[PDB]
Swiss-Prot record, chain B:
Name the UniProt record assigns to this protein: 26S proteasome non-ATPase regulatory subunit 1
Protein family (similarity comment): Belongs to the proteasome subunit S1 family.
Full protein stretch here: 1 to 187 of 953
Gene: PSMD1
Role summary: Component of the 26S proteasome, a multiprotein complex involved in the ATP-dependent degradation of ubiquitinated proteins. This complex plays a key role in the maintenance of protein homeostasis by removing misfolded or damaged proteins, which could impair cellular functions, and by removing proteins whose functions are no longer required. Therefore, the proteasome participates in numerous cellular processes, including cell cycle progression, apoptosis, or DNA damage repair.
Sequence positions bearing N-acetylmethionine: 1
Subunit structure: Component of the 19S proteasome regulatory particle complex. The 26S proteasome consists of a 20S core particle (CP) and two 19S regulatory subunits (RP). The regulatory particle is made of a lid composed of 9 subunits, a base containing 6 ATPases and few additional components including PSMD1. Interacts with ADRM1. Interacts with ZFAND1.
From Swiss-Prot, chain C:
Domain PCI intervals: 269-448
An individual GO BP term: regulation of protein catabolic process
GO cellular component: cytosol; extracellular exosome; extracellular region; ficolin-1-rich granule lumen; membrane; nucleoplasm; nucleus; proteasome accessory complex
SMART domains associated with the record: PAM, PINT
Amino acid composition bias (Pro residues), ranges on this chain: 1-15
Sites of the Glycyl lysine isopeptide (Lys-Gly) (interchain with G-Cter in SUMO1) crosslink: 21
GO molecular function: enzyme regulator activity
Coiled coil: none
PANTHER family named among the record's database cross-references: 26S PROTEASOME NON-ATPASE REGULATORY SUBUNIT 3 (PTHR10758:SF2), 26S PROTEASOME NON-ATPASE REGULATORY SUBUNIT 3/COP9 SIGNALOSOME COMPLEX SUBUNIT 3 (PTHR10758)
Sites of Phosphoserine modification: 401, 413
Protein name: 26S proteasome non-ATPase regulatory subunit 3
UniProtKB/Swiss-Prot annotation, chain D:
Subcellular location field: Nucleus
Domain of life: Eukaryota
Function: Component of the 26S proteasome, a multiprotein complex involved in the ATP-dependent degradation of ubiquitinated proteins. This complex plays a key role in the maintenance of protein homeostasis by removing misfolded or damaged proteins, which could impair cellular functions, and by removing proteins whose functions are no longer required. Therefore, the proteasome participates in numerous cellular processes, including cell cycle progression, apoptosis, or DNA damage repair.
GO biological process annotation, one example: mRNA export from nucleus
UniProt cross-references to InterPro entries, sorted A to Z: DSS1_SEM1
Organism for this UniProt entry: Homo sapiens
PANTHER family named in the record: 26 PROTEASOME COMPLEX SUBUNIT DSS1 (PTHR16771), 26S PROTEASOME COMPLEX SUBUNIT SEM1 (PTHR16771:SF0)
Family recorded in the similarity comment: Belongs to the DSS1/SEM1 family.
Membrane-spanning residues: none
Name the UniProt record assigns to this protein: 26S proteasome complex subunit SEM1
Swiss-Prot record, chain E:
Organism field: Homo sapiens (Human)
Membrane-traversing stretches: none
Function: Component of the 26S proteasome, a multiprotein complex involved in the ATP-dependent degradation of ubiquitinated proteins. This complex plays a key role in the maintenance of protein homeostasis by removing misfolded or damaged proteins, which could impair cellular functions, and by removing proteins whose functions are no longer required. Therefore, the proteasome participates in numerous cellular processes, including cell cycle progression, apoptosis, or DNA damage repair.
Lineage: Eukaryota, Metazoa, Chordata, Craniata, Vertebrata
Top-level taxon of origin: Eukaryota
Residues of the whole record sequence present: 11 to 59 of 406
Subcellular location: Cytoplasm; Nucleus
Subunit structure: Component of the 19S proteasome regulatory particle complex. The 26S proteasome consists of a 20S core particle (CP) and two 19S regulatory subunits (RP). The regulatory particle is made of a lid composed of 9 subunits, a base containing 6 ATPases including PSMC5 and few additional components. Component of a complex with USP49 and RUVBL1. Interacts with PRPF19. Interacts with TRIM5. Interacts with NDC80. Interacts with PAAF1. Interacts, in vitro, with the thyroid hormone receptor (in a thyroid hormone T3-dependent manner) and with retinoid X receptor (RXR). Interacts with ERCC6.
Assigned protein family: Belongs to the AAA ATPase family.
Protein's name according to its UniProt entry: 26S proteasome regulatory subunit 8
């Protein structure tokens, strides 16, 4: 309406310095354009879906610059256009994709419970013939399985699509959870399993986790301490609190009397 | 319009408040529909309420006060309600206004009773805007007085000069004084 | 034709006598009770009202009555109308107006005279004094009878009934607050009406207005309420949030409150069913399980056969997720059986834990549970089979074979075995000791209970809680006898 | 209220509209033998019966052949 | 205006709810004093004994 805007839209610019000024300009224009959904005159669906698109690609740049608050911000803003009273709004092709990125965010932020409760709306039977649609639910299902082997073996199955790097980011943010769980060591473990489970010869884990967990290292073996070494009480204190409970019993049994 | 939309939260957590203004204005429309959505933004509202950075304290104070009696006790709501500073509100039949002025009056006369047995010393500070918003509705009900609650509220407020302007314009003065004493002897 | 014609008149006016007697006894009884003191008596006739409703819900009354039996619709209460005093002539008129239609015949209709039901409330409902309670006790009982048979273009007339109900009372109210027993009844009555046109709501269009304003109507009720009506109005909102919500960030833990005393011997069951259904999505093993099972063990009053069957289905469905699934034992009814018949084979097949065959078997004859939609809990269950299976392994012996048990679990590999086992260990739902010596992984796997091991700290909370329940049970044998001795 | 039981009952009526008295009789074949018997014990009975329904249903006669081989 | 017939009205109805709480106090005092009269009747009975 105001101008073309299609010039710098489809164009991919590595530098986000100009994209930031363009973004701010878009904010200045959309400022009086009533971000909130409007059913008035019904002809505003064009500028609404246009704003939806530029906020979608804006979210693409937002996740390109790796901005956590901005991403969930634009996702919360686009969720307004995603959930609406009128069903006359056409379904975008990148809608389920960006929603998939939202699932990625929920998985990365350990919000995956909200993902589980979000699992209801996604099977809308709109397409279902695409592997990308069944990808996040199967990956999270494998996460419920806990097996990192299937993911690593199916890592080469991902097509030429460019979110593979974001999947690598997902592995990068879940690696502390996986390694954190496998290194728990209720009793003890042997290094021969560690060779298989842990990553390659690059000393990232043996460095970081050494200053993180702060444990002792023996002759090529991982030792675990503070396991079931906890000493019980002297039975004096729970006897006292039980006496207090007896007093409370005297109260409740006889108060009004 | 919006219900489960989390966008206004991100907008409330966002800088350059000039775009936050109309967002809060539209928030005041749906705040009656859903008060649970503002619950996560309550803390940030308090934060922006504390500092003097924002120009309008009443805009945040209203939202805080209305979401507080929806969430927690009426006390915390009344704190920001009476701490809203200068506020212009016309008389309405809505539940919110009548309830917050109900708690306002109740707590006012409560403090009056608490300060009744202490004529001198350790006097609690009393804001002028409170007396203003109280005496506004008080006078509004004191127009014709409706020959019932005038002397009642005049007595319940425990103020010395409050009932002197009530007897200025009245019908059947001896009857009004007799009714007044009859009301005063039964308390 | 001559036989059926001669036998035609007796059957249709069968319910008339006991129905007139019913409304006379209930109306005259309640009004004649609270007339002296309305504010004193509280919810004495309430249980009677809900009982009469639940009793009249199954009514077979109108079947062949569609033809000229509708003459009862135009006529109505007409008790002491247009004047407060001089009720004697009207006491005569009570017999008179009934005698008028009892001479020869009467002119009757169905869809002809409908809308002008608001004529009397425009001036005087009955006595010009008791109008709200007499008015609601007049209009509200006969409305579902006229609004019966929702289908066949009664939707528009139902909308007329809606706007009429609103405009006369519901829109806002006849006055600020009634603050009486008729109000305490008006809560559950208006709620019941909401449930009544709820079907009309969900039928075709959606909600842009009413239940959204029902929040303002809810808080218009003061916080000093017993929140019975508030909870009943919360039930319809929660049911409206039942099918599609998916946002747990607010109403979960925001909607939590002081939770005042409410029984009703219904609302507990249905609300626990609602919040149980909501809390069944995150698979809660501790709370949801026992509380929904208890909820199933509750509400004996009316029907556990046709109601509790759904919560029982959900119960066993969320039960088989733990690997141990109890079946139907103590309850014998020819409903839950047929309902669980297609699900019986697979829920019995859960303990076996065969991935390959049952993967095809489920989808083969699968109908209803896959008609639940979006394949959620089943796509969870498919890979939950191996977790319940490895849990069965945790309940099994320690030593793990590279061949035998690997073939039994249909999974053979050194890495994924110990890996998945470790994933079962990190859950914290079991007990195992990880040890590596010869390359084999053993476990202590002690399932032994708390007997003769830290007994005090073990059954402490049990003793405290059970004593609390027994003590509030003492309160339960305390207060009601006082409620008996209050009037004597 | 209890009025919410109506669509459920209608659903049951639909379930009865699917097939006419087929599962009634088909399961009556078993139930006639299961009649008058406690349904509490029938849980483990049906459990084992369905468990051995696939293979090794009897296995008692196979033990004698498994004596020399095992 | 819309106060005396509104605010003072809901205040009087709040007072009616207060009358309900004091009605609970009332009949609690009633059954408590009836039980009191019962125990006093038995005590007077053994006094007659």
């Amino acid at each position: 309406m105001y101008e073309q805007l299609k010039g710098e839209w489809n164009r991919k610019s590595p530098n986000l310095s100009k994209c930031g000024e363009e973004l701010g300009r878009l904010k200045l224009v959309l400022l009086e354009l009533n971000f909130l959904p409007t059913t008035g005159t019904k002809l505003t669906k064009q500028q609404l879906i246009l704003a939806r698109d530029i906020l979608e690609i804006g979210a693409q740049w937002s996740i390109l610059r790796k901005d956590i608050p901005s991403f969930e911000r634009y996702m919360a803003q686009l969720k307004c256009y995603y959930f609406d009273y009128k069903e006359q709004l056409p379904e975008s092709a990148y809608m389920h994709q960006l929603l998939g990125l939202n699932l990625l965010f929920l998985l990365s932020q350990n919000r995956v419970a909200e993902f589980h409760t979000e699992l209801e709306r996604l099977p809308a039977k709109d397409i279902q013939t695409n592997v990308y649609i069944k990808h996040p639910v199967s990956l999270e299902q494998y996460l419920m399985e806990g097996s990192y082997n299937k993911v690593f073996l199916a890592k080469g199955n991902i097509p030429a699509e460019s979110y593979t790097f974001f999947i690598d980011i997902l592995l990068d943010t879940i690696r502390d959870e996986i390694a954190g769980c496998i290194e728990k060591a209720y009793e003890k473990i042997l290094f021969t399993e560690a060779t298989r489970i842990l990553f390659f010869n690059t000393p990232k884990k043996m460095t970081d986790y050494a200053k993180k967990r702060g444990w002792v290292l023996g002759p090529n073996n991982y030792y675990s301490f503070a396991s079931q070494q906890q000493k019980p009480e002297d039975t004096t204190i729970p006897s006292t609190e039980l006496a207090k409970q007896v007093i409370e019993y005297a109260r409740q049994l006889e108060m009004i009397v | 319009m919006i219900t489960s939309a989390a966008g206004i939260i991100s907008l409330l957590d966002e800088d350059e408040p000039q775009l936050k203004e109309f967002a809060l204005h539209k928030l005041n429309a749906v705040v009656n529909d859903f008060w649970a959505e503002i619950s996560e933004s309550v803390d940030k509202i308090e934060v922006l309420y504390e500092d003097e950075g924002f120009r309008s304290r009443q805009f945040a104070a209203l939202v805080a006060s209305k979401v507080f009696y929806h969430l927690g006790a009426f006390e915390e709501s009344l704190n920001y309600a009476l701490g809203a500073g200068d506020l212009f509100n016309v008389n309405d039949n809505s539940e919110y206004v009548e309830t917050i002025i109900a708690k306002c009056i109740d707590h006012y006369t409560k403090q009056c009773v608490e300060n009744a047995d202490l004529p001198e010393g350790e006097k609690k500070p009393i804001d002028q805007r409170l007396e203003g918003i109280v005496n506004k509705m008080f006078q509004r009900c004191l127009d014709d007085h409706k020959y019932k609650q005038a002397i009642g509220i005049a007595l319940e407020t425990r103020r010395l000069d409050v009932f002197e302007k009530t007897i200025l314009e009245s019908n059947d003065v001896p009857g009004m004084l007799a009714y007044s004493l009859k009301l005063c002897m039964s308390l | 034709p001559p036989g059926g014609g001669e036998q035609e008149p007796p059957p249709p006016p069968a319910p008339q006598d006991v129905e007139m007697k019913e409304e006379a006894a209930t109306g005259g009884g309640s009004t004649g009770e609270a007339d002296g003191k309305t504010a004193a008596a509280a919810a004495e006739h309430s249980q009677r009202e809900l009982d009469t409703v639940t009793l009249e819900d199954i009514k077979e009354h109108v079947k062949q009555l569609e033809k000229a039996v509708s003459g009862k619709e135009p006529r109505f209460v007409l008790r002491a109308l247009r004047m407060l005093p001089s009720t004697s002539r009207r006491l005569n008129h009570y017999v008179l107006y009934k005698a008028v239609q009892g001479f020869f015949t009467s002119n009757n209709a169905t869809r002809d005279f409908l809308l002008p039901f608001l004529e009397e409330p425009m001036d005087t409902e009955a006595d010009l004094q008791f109008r709200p309670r007499t008015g609601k006790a007049a209009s509200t009982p006969l409305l579902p009878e006229v609004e019966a048979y929702l289908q066949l273009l009664v939707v528009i007339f139902m909308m007329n009934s809606k706007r009429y109900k609103e405009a006369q009372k519901i829109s806002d109210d006849l006055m600020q607050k009634i603050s009486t027993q008729n109000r305490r009844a008006l809560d559950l009555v208006a709620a019941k009406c909401y449930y009544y046109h709820a079907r009309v709501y969900e039928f075709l269009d959606k909600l842009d207005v009413v239940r959204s304003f029902l929040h303002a109507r809810l808080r218009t009720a003061t916080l000093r309420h017993d929140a019975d009506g508030q909870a009943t109005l919360l039930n319809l909102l929660l049911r409206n949030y039942l099918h599609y919500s998916l946002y747990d960030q607010a109403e979960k833990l925001v909607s939590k409150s002081v939770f005042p005393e409410q029984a009703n011997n219904n609302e507990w069951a249905r609300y626990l069913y609602y919040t149980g259904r909501i809390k069944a999505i995150q698979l809660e093993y501790s709370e949801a399980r026992r509380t929904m099972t208890n909820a199933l063990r509750k509400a004996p009053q009316h029907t556990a056969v046709g109601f509790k069957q759904t919560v029982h289905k959900l119960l066993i469905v969320v039960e088989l997720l733990l690997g141990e699934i109890p079946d139907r034992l103590q309850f014998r009814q020819p409903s839950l059986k047929r309902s669980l018949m297609p699900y019986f084979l697979l829920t019995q097949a859960v303990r076996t834990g065969n991935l390959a065959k049952f993967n095809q078997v489920l989808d083969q004859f699968g109908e209803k549970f896959q008609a639940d939609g979006t394949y959620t809990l089943i796509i969870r269950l498919r890979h939950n089979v191996i977790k319940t299976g490895v849990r069965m392994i945790s309940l099994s012996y320690s030593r793990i074979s590279l061949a035998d048990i690997a073939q039994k679990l249909q999974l053979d590999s050194p890495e994924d075995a110990e890996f998945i086992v470790a994933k079962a260990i990190r859950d914290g739902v079991i007990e195992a000791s990880i040890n590596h010596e010869k390359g084999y992984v053993q476990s202590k796997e002690m399932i032994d209970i708390y007997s003769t091991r830290e007994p005090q700290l073990a059954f402490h909370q049990r003793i405290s809680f059970c004593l609390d329940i027994h003590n509030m049970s003492v309160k339960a044998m305390r207060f009601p006898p006082k409620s008996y001795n209050k009037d004597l | 209220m209890s009025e919410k039981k109506q669509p459920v009952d209608l659903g049951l009526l639909e379930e009865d509209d699917e097939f006419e008295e087929f599962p009634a009789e088909d399961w009556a074949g078993l139930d006639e033998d299961e009649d008058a018997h406690v349904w509490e014990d029938n849980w483990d009975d049906d459990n084992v019966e369905d468990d051995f329904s696939n293979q090794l249903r009897a296995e008692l006669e196979k033990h004698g052949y498994k004596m020399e081989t095992s | 205006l819309e106060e005396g017939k509104a605010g003072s009205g809901l205040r009087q109805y709040y007072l009616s709810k207060i009358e309900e709480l004091q009605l609970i106090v009332n009949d609690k005092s009633q059954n408590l004093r009836r039980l009191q009269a019962q125990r006093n009747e038995l005590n007077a009975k053994v006094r007659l004994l």
